Amino acid sequence: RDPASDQMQHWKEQRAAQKADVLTTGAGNPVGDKLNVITVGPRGPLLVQDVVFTDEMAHFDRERIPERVVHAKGAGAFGYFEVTHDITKYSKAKVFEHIGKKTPIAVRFSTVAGESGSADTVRDPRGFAVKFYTEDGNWDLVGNNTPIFFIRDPILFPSFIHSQKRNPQTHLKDPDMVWDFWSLRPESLHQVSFLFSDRGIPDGHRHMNGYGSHTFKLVNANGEAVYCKFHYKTDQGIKNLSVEDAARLSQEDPDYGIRDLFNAIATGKYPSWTFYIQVMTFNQAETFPFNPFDLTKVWPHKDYPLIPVGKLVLNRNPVNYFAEVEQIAFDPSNMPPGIEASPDKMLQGRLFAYPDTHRHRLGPNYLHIPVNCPYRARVANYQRDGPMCMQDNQGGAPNYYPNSFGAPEQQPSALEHSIQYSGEVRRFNTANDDNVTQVRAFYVNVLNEEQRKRLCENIAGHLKDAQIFIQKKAVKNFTEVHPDYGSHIQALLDKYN
Amino acid sequence: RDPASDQMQHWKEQRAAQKADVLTTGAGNPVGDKLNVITVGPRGPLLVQDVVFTDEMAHFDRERIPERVVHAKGAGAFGYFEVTHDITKYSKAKVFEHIGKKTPIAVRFSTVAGESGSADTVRDPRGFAVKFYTEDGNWDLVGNNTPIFFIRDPILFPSFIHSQKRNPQTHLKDPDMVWDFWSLRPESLHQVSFLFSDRGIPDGHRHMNGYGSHTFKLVNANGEAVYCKFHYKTDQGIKNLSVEDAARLSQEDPDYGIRDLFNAIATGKYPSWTFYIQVMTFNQAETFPFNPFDLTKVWPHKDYPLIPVGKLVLNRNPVNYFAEVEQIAFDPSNMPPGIEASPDKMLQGRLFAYPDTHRHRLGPNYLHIPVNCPYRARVANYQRDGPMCMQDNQGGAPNYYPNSFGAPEQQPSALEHSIQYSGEVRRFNTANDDNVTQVRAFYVNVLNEEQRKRLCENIAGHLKDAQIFIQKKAVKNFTEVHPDYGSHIQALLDKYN
Amino acid sequence: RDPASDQMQHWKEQRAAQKADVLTTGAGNPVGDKLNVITVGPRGPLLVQDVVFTDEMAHFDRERIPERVVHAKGAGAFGYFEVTHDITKYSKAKVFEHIGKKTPIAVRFSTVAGESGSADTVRDPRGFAVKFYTEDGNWDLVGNNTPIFFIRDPILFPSFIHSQKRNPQTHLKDPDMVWDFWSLRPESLHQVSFLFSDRGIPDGHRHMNGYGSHTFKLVNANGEAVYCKFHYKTDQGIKNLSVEDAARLSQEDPDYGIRDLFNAIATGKYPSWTFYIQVMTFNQAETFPFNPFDLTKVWPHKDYPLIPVGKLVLNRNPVNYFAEVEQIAFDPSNMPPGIEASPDKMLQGRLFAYPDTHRHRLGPNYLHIPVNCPYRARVANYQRDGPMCMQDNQGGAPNYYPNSFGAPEQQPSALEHSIQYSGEVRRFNTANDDNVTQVRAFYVNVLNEEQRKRLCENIAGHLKDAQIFIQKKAVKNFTEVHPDYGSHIQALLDKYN
Amino acid sequence: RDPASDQMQHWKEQRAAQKADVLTTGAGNPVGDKLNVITVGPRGPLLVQDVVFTDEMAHFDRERIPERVVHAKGAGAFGYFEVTHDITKYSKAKVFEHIGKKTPIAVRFSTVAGESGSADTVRDPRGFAVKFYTEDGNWDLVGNNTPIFFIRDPILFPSFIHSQKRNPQTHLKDPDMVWDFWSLRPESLHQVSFLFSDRGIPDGHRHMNGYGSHTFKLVNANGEAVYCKFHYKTDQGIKNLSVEDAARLSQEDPDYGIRDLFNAIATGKYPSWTFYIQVMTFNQAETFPFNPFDLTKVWPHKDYPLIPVGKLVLNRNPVNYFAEVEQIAFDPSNMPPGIEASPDKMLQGRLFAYPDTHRHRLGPNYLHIPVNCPYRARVANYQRDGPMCMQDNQGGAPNYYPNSFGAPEQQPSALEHSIQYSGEVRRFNTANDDNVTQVRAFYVNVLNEEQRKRLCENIAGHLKDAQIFIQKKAVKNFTEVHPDYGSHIQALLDKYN
Ligand code: HEM
């Protein structure tokens, strides 16, 4: 059998030659018998003094935590990030200090819209989150398998996710909800085209690219700032499932990506990604034809070539899935000195959203969870007492700042990069921005004829379930991108009806 | 399209001729714009004074509650229970007072081992929980589609569920775990045979029986007590999917039972179940060949014929699934006067487990949730203040008992039925009880030859993935039930290997 | 006896002539007996089937919610706000629509630093929070009994509160912590002088003023904006306890303000406050000698006279304290159209802090708690499912925006007031701003000689416990305010040592 | 100054000669500046990218956990338990294995009815809880400063505590509630007499006795069982405050017992208690004049002399109060092999109540909190995944029992002691048991004349606030105990009226 199937037998074999441990309660008291309950004779009622029973049961009743509101179904792995090139001119980050420096990483792969228990091999954006345990605290690159997203304003994210998930009355997937949203929000055409292309259903997590997707800000030691996009492309090469194979695997193995990643790491075939960046100067940002902070746009490779930085290798599988993968938390706000946020509205919304949801899901002190702890750095601050505190709580150190007792002091070299912003403080409309230019480019330059045909059949297959007016609004947006794109979908829809 | 698909269009049509409501914050303040966020000009960072954003997002970040530790995937419906026969001689329950009395009910159907997002059409026991809103408080008949269960002691339940669910390292379904447990616990042969028969994969929730499974105690107005088993058999008739059809539906519609029940109720075809009981006297209980409180045994129909009581009709679909189906809580401890627990160890464990898990999942004041409230009864007690209290909290009434200020008094007619139990207070072993007699009866009397063949192929298909020694231990137990049963499985396993 | 003592007798008298209600479980099942537990004979162990016991106990074990991190000890009352003057030229708020309009209000009084169970009559700032149930959602004026605060940057608030509360090792009040913070942060001199004056220990909650303390922004229907300060001065007149009387009442009645407010409202003597505003134009704000948004400064009455608006009357006592006073939540972010935030940094920090802590303390759906609900307004939005949801959860309405099914639409008349802000986006230092001018004014103009002497003895009495260097740093700041102020404290400190 | 006041200066002195640590976020990222917030220029609104602010504030907003429903105000200390005598003939507990064996202990002192922030020096039962970190898991002796309690049935405990605490409408202490309960429940006369004697207000926590109060069951290695009462009497001697001194200290130092214990341990004067037991055989239990498991009765010293076991010394003060004292959890159910529960109904109720409330207060995994962990024992079991899991979660070990992979096995030597109980399973009334015999003994044998007078004045002082009929019912119960007791109270009450 595969290594995944032989988990229990491998556990037994690695612990052979030693006697079984004593079964205890949570409080360490030895259990006399855990197969029977205390009764008033053979056919009598259960006693309250059955403390072993009520402890076991009470813990069983409290096993479930809330699943992630998005990216619930997921797969986890560990390894390191190795620097291969010098980018110290761009960033002063300790993760990029010198060549050959290895930082430990934790990664989680996921499907955006699926719940815990949903099939792996389905058409959906794949999450690709990376947690770098840097000497200057944790760095969380929370990325996707696509360089763009559907929307460009963060106030629409809850709407988008509600449309992608189940109907609130029926509890069913509603193509009506999905295509109503997408047809009303035509800045999703670019991400929709990528999603309904061949790379919508990647063959596992080893054969997909990863992107930061956002513009980030690199600051060097001299204090100069540039703009960046992170790319981590697969070294195993891009590889996708057909719709038929994906549909078969959905019933055969709904845990295809968990099994694939576990077996790959267990057999020694460590998957690797090459870490690239694009650099954009402030003058180039001002003279960019589009908004360079627009999450629905990319930076073309001819104008902005990829600069290699290092490689990501995953070599260690999780010991316990719940402890290492279910409880891992990735905060985009976790950025070490040298890396900062850009004015990208979406990124600004993510800076709030993640720590908030982590406090709900995991709890106030979620950063004390081992996988979340910045173990390669020293944390000292005036943050004290909350629920489930599993440190000394910084002992008897003064808990106010400023003070006169040598408590932790602010480091002035870790200040943010200052910038002058123009305009009023109000709500600016971005719905009416360019929605079709880069989509047309992708359609008529990147895709070939058979790829265009498959893209159109995939869209038409999903969109046929929507109402007629929604089909018309969607096809109109596809026609505005390119007339062949719209006409081919319309022809297939007419066939389907 | 089917009624399920037209939820949104039906919502719009029923609310036609009125203008759209004003979009407000949670605090009722009108929202000026909810498509854009406040920035420092067109390409500026997000402001904290964007209260509309942070409210929306904060609520989105806290949408998920913990799924049920078991029976997570589920389907909900509402209707009534109509009394057709007089059983007042057996029970003094207000639910059974007089003929033609209608009590409102809430029902939830489920699969035991599947998570939220798992396929509906899979081989698993189906949950069939019924909440009767009686004048003497709520009655929760928390039943299954099988009259028995796998185990007879409640301390093994967490072990059983852990074996049925995912491996703690790999996060995969482990046939090794499933069949190791079942082979080591041979009192599961009866439930295993039922599960791997044709009724393992029922065609939706309308075409399955329901059983209390436990022995309950009926007390009449005179104070005499008897033993009972609740049966609710389908009026639509038993109907099952083939393995191939089930496997197809798993990828086609993972929400087959939700869709089926919604469409059935929406089109007017209300499903109905006929409520039966078996009665067992205390002398018959003492002279029963088996333990009558053993959850792995049934009461044979020749010795204990079914007595009709009434019918269960489901006529109303949930308005909002989360509010009515996700948040509904069924407590087996919720039993009105006339209905009591028997010495069945399993039932004794359920009396603790459910209210405990409900306090974790939903919260301390989960009985204030509308679907959980005993709205057809008046609650008055000395239970005060907890989190998320949404009543007057019983206003300024004295909060201690006894008192001298006319606070709620105990009703002496609602006392429990007293019984003398013999034997020591200790742990009695029940693993070595009869495990094969009723299993043999079922195999050679109920099943025909082609049903026996399908049963053997279904078991062999699942058990082939287990290690050789586990296969041998399982086949041994099947051989001890019946040699043809064991030999046929063994032949198929040898073919599979 | 006083009305407060006769709560139980009044309850009995108002419910005379009717029989006591039936004592039920939470699920509405009648309790047979609630004075004894089920045992295996007279001297036998307790049974698990004692469901009445375990329900009662389980609820008792979950009674406590987290106290407010600040303003834990508090007193609650209800009444109305009556408009007496027209300020429609300044604000378009429905609360100020027309003369004679009554809006229901909820008020909570409190002590900032005391825990639940601490003495009422102590030297501390008093909280004075007002919740207006306006037709345009709730308005929460979360004020103090002082027009200023200790600090002007919100990042120092957790430090300030930690210094005011107990030592993290000893769990004792530390004058060392208090005066170290205050001596290092000399912008607290103004609030410190007010706190150690006679109005530090008001005689109950009826004899104290209330202030918004922050600059707010009033917007009229025409779209013009001005700046505002809310004052609500007592109609019963300012009245204070001596240090000796306060010290006596601390042991005699630690619940002096709860008793005083309950008896005042119960006897019919309804306390009232007159609602005033100060108005500041944008040109006056630019030409103000100080920062007009500085929370340590006031607007002098000669330059900015008080403009009457209406009166606040409290006429109704809470029915249940836990439900109405412990669970009430005041969000400064809850502001109806016509009222907005100013650039005051402190106010900006409060816009985040309150809804965050409310989600922790009360829970995600704390706005469904009756006292927190905007019952005089209609809430409709795309916020769905969280823990302890006690509404229909907006039934089957579309849960995404924008949509094509007539779901709630944004109201363009409720947009925020736009303003152009100059300068870089960075951290600006405000520690080095004016700290002594208005403090000197207060000391030598408002206070008389005997008031100056009492102020100095109160400061010296508290500050004597601090270390010598902290005393010197504090006296230096007092000397920089005024040499007589510093010299008098120093003389008293030398006497104390 | 005293050691308690010099906590900060001692912290600075012990950390002299090293530079201050770097101030970091929770994620370990260095903070550039934590005195100012990011604004749009000097007088601009706060930015969302102020991640340092929102992290600090978010943690500050979640500092409070729920206080203990009882014994909220408390004081904590650490030390060891030294065995001085051999009781191996009575118990096989590892804590009592051999002479000179030191087990580490954690102790918490408390007042039953006071909230967090209430005065220490008040008339109330004092809690005296001891947590022994034994090699066979934790042992929690959760005791009081009195050998008895007010009630003998655990279903009345929530009523008793509600009566002792604040009125649900007024939020005030109600003598009406207190004396109504006590007058209706005359089995409280014994504990009431002890409480209103001189030992009602002990002088700190060092000058009070400690009692288990319950009958426990000692089992030896041979398998014979006896009954036990634990006594731990002070080596510093019993010492009490007068009513006047206590009333003074209530305003002067509400944290008198925290200060006293901190200074005592800090100066080196380690307080000590001598551990005694009483032994009662099963034949003596059957022939005892009273119920030997009655919590309102004691075992007289002439019939049952004290047997020395060892001494309890407290030598270490808590480093951080929140982490070590607020979060410490004591479970009476935590009993190592050799120590078991008796049929005492109260003890039976405590076996359920404590682990339930701990899951609410601290969380599901509260035993992972360092102070609660059984660090001197090895815990291995089939309890997995809950919120805030801070272990490996037992890695990849099989999570079901029984299994075939060498997972932890039950130890048959840790079985409970079996006993045959007679009688029906129902509710037996114990309200009508003897209530006055031992109370009379205490009154006329233990107390002298001036002690009797002070007892009567203390009762009369508290009871004067109750209504006339409650005074009459209370005095009647005191008269039934002894006519001089009742007549003296009545005379003082008549004087007070
Ligand atoms: C039916 C009887 C009783 C019930 C239901 C009960 C219940 C409780 C509860 C719920 C707590 C709060 C624990 C926490 O949340 O941390 C508690 C604390 C406490 N109880 Fe009891 N109790 C009972 C009887 C007694 C008796 C008889 C004693 C002493 C002889 C006692 C001593 C204490 C002490 C000392 C604490 C505080 C423990 C600590 O230091 O954290 N209780 N009890």
CATH of the domain at D14: 4.10.91.20
- Could you tell me if D285 and D172 lie in one domain? no
Which amino acid is it at B434? D
End-to-end CA distance of chain C: 47
Contact check, Cβ <8 Å, B23/C411? yes
Q: In the block, which residue shows the tokens 């006697």?
A: A19
- Report the CATH number that the domain containing residue D157 is assigned in CATH: 1.20.1370.60
Tokens linked to A131: 């947690």
3-class SS of residue A74:
strand
Contact of A198 with C439, CB cutoff 8 Å: no
Q: Is B144 a catalytic residue?
A: yes
CA geometry: angle at A317 spanning A313 and A323, to 5°?
A: 120
Residue to mutate among A11, A18, A23, with most D CBs inside 10 A, is A23
What is the SS3 string spanning chain C? CCCCCCHHHHHHHHCCCCCCCECECCCCCECCCCCCCEEECCCCCEECCCHHHHHHHHHHHCCCCCCCCCCCCEEEEEEEEEECCCCCCCCCCHHHCCCCCEEEEEEEEEECCCCCCCCCCCCCCEEEEEEEEECCEEEEEEEECCCCCCCCCHHHHHHHHHHHCECCCCCCECHHHHHHHHHHCHHHHHHHHHHHCHHHCECCCCCCCEECCCCEEEECCCCCEEEEEEEEEECCCCCECCHHHHHHHHHHCCCHHHHHHHHHHHHCCCCEEEEEEEEECHHHHHCCCCCCCCCCCCCCCCCCCCEEEEEEEEEECCCCHHHHHHCCCCCCCCCCCCEEECCCHHHHHHHHHHHHHHHHHCCCCHHHCCCCCCCCCCCCCCCCCCCCCCCCCCCCCCCCCCCCCCCCECCHHHCCCCEECCCEEEECCCCCCCCCHHHHHHHHHHCCHHHHHHHHHHHHHHHCCCCHHHHHHHHHHHHHHCHHHHHHHHHHHHHHC
Are the beta carbons of A313 and A82 closer than 8 angstroms?
yes
Residue nearest to atom 6 of ligand 1 (CA): D350
Among protein residues, the one whose CA lies closest to atom 15 of ligand 1 = D68
Q: Cα distance from C454 to chain D (closest Cα, Å)?
A: 20
In terms of domains, do A126 and A168 share one? no
Whether the ω angle into residue C402 lies within 30 degrees of 0, i.e. cis, is: yes
CB atoms within 10 A of CB D468: 9
CA dist., res. C346 & res. C362, Å (int): 24
Query: What residue has token string 């997000």?
Result: B46
Residues A93 and A211 in one domain: yes
Declared resolution, Å: 2.4
Chains touching C (at least 3 CB pairs under 8 A) are A, B, D
Contacts of C204 (CB under 8 A, 6+ apart): C256, C257, C260, C261, C264
User: Using CA atoms, how far apart are residues C471 and D269, in angstroms rounded to an integer?
Assistant: 32
Identify whether residues A263 and A292 lie together within a single domain. Answer: yes
- What whole-number distance in Å separates Cα of residue D384 and Cα of residue B165? 13
Q: How was this structure determined?
A: cryo-EM
In a domain, D237, yes or no: yes
Q: CA-CA distances (angstroms) from residue A415 to A140, A339, D38, D67?
A: 19, 11, 11, 39
Asked whether residue B49 is domain-assigned, the answer is yes
Q: How far apart are CA D338 and CA C179, in angstroms?
A: 54
| C-beta atoms surrounding A268 within 10 Å | 7
Reported residue count of chain A is: 497
| D408, two tokens | 């932890």
Q: Which of C349, C373, C397 is the last residue of a domain?
A: C373
Contact (CB, 8 A) for B338 and B309:
no
Instruction: Give the integer Cα–Cα distance in Å for A66 and A99.
Output: 41
Answer yes or no: are the C-beta atoms of A329 and A369 closer than 8 Å.
yes
Taking the C-alpha atoms of residue B70 and residue D271, their distance in angstroms, rounded to an integer, is 51
Instruction: Report the number of distinct structural domains present in chain B.
Output: 3
Identify all chain C residues contacting A400, using CB atoms and an 8 Å cutoff: 159-160, 162-163, 177, 180-181
Q: Most distant CA pair in chain D: distance in Å?
A: 86
CB of D205 closer than 8 Å to CB of D109: yes
Specify whether D93 is located in the same domain as D223.
Answer: yes
Contact predicate C205/C255, CB 8 Å: no
User: Counting beta carbons within 10 angstroms of the beta carbon of residue A494, is it exposed (0 to 12), middle (13 to 18) or buried (19 or more)?
Assistant: exposed
- The contacts of residue B79 (CB under 8 Å, 6+ apart) are B104, B105, B107, B270, B312, B313, B314, B315, B316
Beta strands across the sheet bearing C419-420: B38-40, A424-427, C419-420
Going by the DSSP 8-state scheme, the letter that residue A254 receives in this structure is T
Q: Which residue type is seen at C440?
A: R
Angle at C29 between CA B363 and CA B219, to 5 degrees: 135
Q: Are C257 and C205 in contact (CB under 8 A)?
A: yes
CA gap D121, D202 in Å, rounded:
8
Structure tokens, B231: 């049966």
Please count the CA atoms within 13 angstroms of the CA of A447 that sit on its side-chain side. 22
Of D47, D169, D425, the CB nearest to B421: D425
The letter for the amino acid at A94 is K
Residue C172, min C-alpha distance to chain B (Å)? 29
Instruction: For residue D424, give every residue at least 6 positions away whose Cβ sits within 8 Å of its Cβ, in sequence order, or none.
Output: B418, B419, B420, C41
In a domain, D427, yes or no: no
Helix, strand or coil, per DSSP, at residue B488: helix
- Quote the tokens at residue B412: 């002496």
Inside any domain, residue A382? no
Q: Is residue D313 one of the residues assigned to a domain?
A: yes
Do residues B59 and B119 both lie within one domain?
no
Longest dimension (CA), chain B: 86
Q: Determine the 3-state secondary structure of D365 from DSSP.
A: coil
Residue D116 to residues C119, C308, D111, D221: CA-CA distances in angstroms?
11, 42, 10, 44
Q: Are A222 and A235 in a shared domain?
A: yes
Please give the Cα distance from C485 to C481 (Å, whole number): 7
Tokens describing residue C132: 């207006």
Atom from ligand 1 closest to the CA of residue D357: 15
Q: Are B392 and B401 in contact (CB under 8 A)?
A: no
- A220 catalytically annotated: no
Residue D422 annotated as binding?
no
The dihedrals phi and psi of B140, each to the nearest 5 degrees, come to -110, 100
Residue owning tokens 């005598």: D85
Beta carbons within 10 angstroms of residue C22's beta carbon: 21
d(CA B77, CA B330): 14
The single residue of A71, A205, A214, A358 carrying the catalytic annotation is A71
Report d(CA C497, CA D268) in Å as an integer.
27
Same domain, B49 and B92: no
Tell me which residue of D32, D36, D35, D27 sits closest to D55, measured CA to CA: D27
For an interface test with C, the pick among A399, A424, A429 (most C C-beta atoms closer than 10 Å) comes out as A399
Looking from the CA of B432 toward its CB, the CA atoms found within 13 Å total: 3
d(CA B289, CA D353): 40
Task: Find the closest chain A residue to D351 by CA distance.
Answer: A49
8 A C-beta contact, residue B27 and residue C378: no
d(CA A348, CA D81): 57
Q: Which of A362, C412, C182 is nearest to D365 (CA)?
A: A362
Same domain, A108 and A51: no
Instruction: State the DSSP H helix or E strand holding residue D453, giving kind and residue range, or none if neither.
Output: helix D449-463
Kindly tell me the burial class for residue B495, based on how many C-beta atoms sit within 10 Å of its own C-beta (0-12, 13-18, 19 or more). Answer: exposed
Tokens of D197: 């004697």
Q: Are residues A291 and A218 in the same domain?
A: yes
Instruction: Please work out, in degrees rounded to the nearest 5, the angle formed at the alpha carbon of residue B152 by the alpha carbons of B148 and B158.
Output: 100
Residue nearest ligand 1's atom 43 by CA: D70
Residue A298's nearest CA partner among A198, A124, A100, A148 is A148
Domain of D190 in residue numbering reads as: 149-199+435-497
Cα gap A451→A242, rounded to integer Å: 12
Distances (CA, A) of D124 to C60, D249, D397: 20, 15, 49
Q: Which phi and psi angles does D124 have, rounded to 5°?
A: -165, 155
The answer to whether D407 and D397 are in contact (CB under 8 A) is: yes
Are B137 and C25 an interchain contact pair (Cβ–Cβ within 8 Å)? yes
Amino acid at A76: G
Q: Of A11, A39, A64, which residue constitutes the final position of a domain?
A: A64
Q: In 3-state terms, what secondary structure has residue D16? A: coil
Distance from C-alpha of D451 to C-alpha of D275, rounded to nearest angstrom? 28
Q: What are phi and psi of D278, to 5 degrees?
A: -105, 145
Computed on alpha carbons and rounded to an integer, the radius of gyration of chain B in Å comes to: 26
Q: Dig out the tokens for B455 from the structure.
A: 């049963």
Whether residues D159 and B48 touch (CB distance < 8 A) is answered with no
Q: Which residue, among B245, D329, A163, B337, has the nearest Cα to C27 in the 3D structure?
A: B337
Give Cβ neighbours of residue B205 (< 8 Å, ≥ 6 apart): B75, B109, B126, B128, B257, B260, B261, B271
Q: Which one of B350, B373, B396 terminates a domain?
A: B373
Same domain, A450 and A460: yes
Does residue A482 form part of some domain? Answer: yes
Q: Which two tokens stand for residue B91?
A: 């029970």
CA angle D257, D263, D264 (to 5 degrees): 85
- Within 13 A of D486's CA, how many CA atoms are on the CB side? 18
> What's the CA-to-centroid distance between C50 and ligand 1, angstroms?
20
CB atoms within 10 A of CB D100: 8
Which whole-number Å values give the CA distances from B54 to A158, B328, C340, C355, in the listed order? 12, 30, 16, 9
Strand B225-234 vs strand B210-211: parallel, antiparallel, or unpaired?
A: antiparallel
Residues in A closer than 8 angstroms to C427, CB to CB, are 415-416
Q: Do C81 and C132 contact (CB within 8 A), yes or no? A: yes
Q: Which residues of A278-315 are buried (b: 16+ CB within 10 A; e: fewer)?
A: bbbeeeebeebeebbbbbbbbbeeeebebeebbbbbbe
- Rg for chain D, CA atoms, rounded: 26
Instruction: Using the structure block, give the residue that is written with the tokens 């436990």.
Output: B214
Could you tell me which residues are beta bridge partners of residue C130? C107, C141
C331 domain-assigned: yes
Residue C288 belongs to a domain: yes
C164 and C135, same structural domain? Answer: no
Q: Assign A32 to helix, strand or coil.
A: coil
In the Cβ-directed half-sphere of C12, how many Cα atoms lie within 13 Å?
10
From residue B176, alpha-carbon distances to A1, B185, D94, D399 in Å are 12, 14, 39, 13
- CATH number for the domain harbouring residue B257: 2.40.180.10
In 3D space, the residue among B214, B230, B174, B195 whose CA is nearest the CA of residue B459 turns out to be B195
CA distance D77 to chain C (A): 11
C374 prior amide bond cis, ω within 30: no
Closest CA to C139 of C356, C330, C304: C330
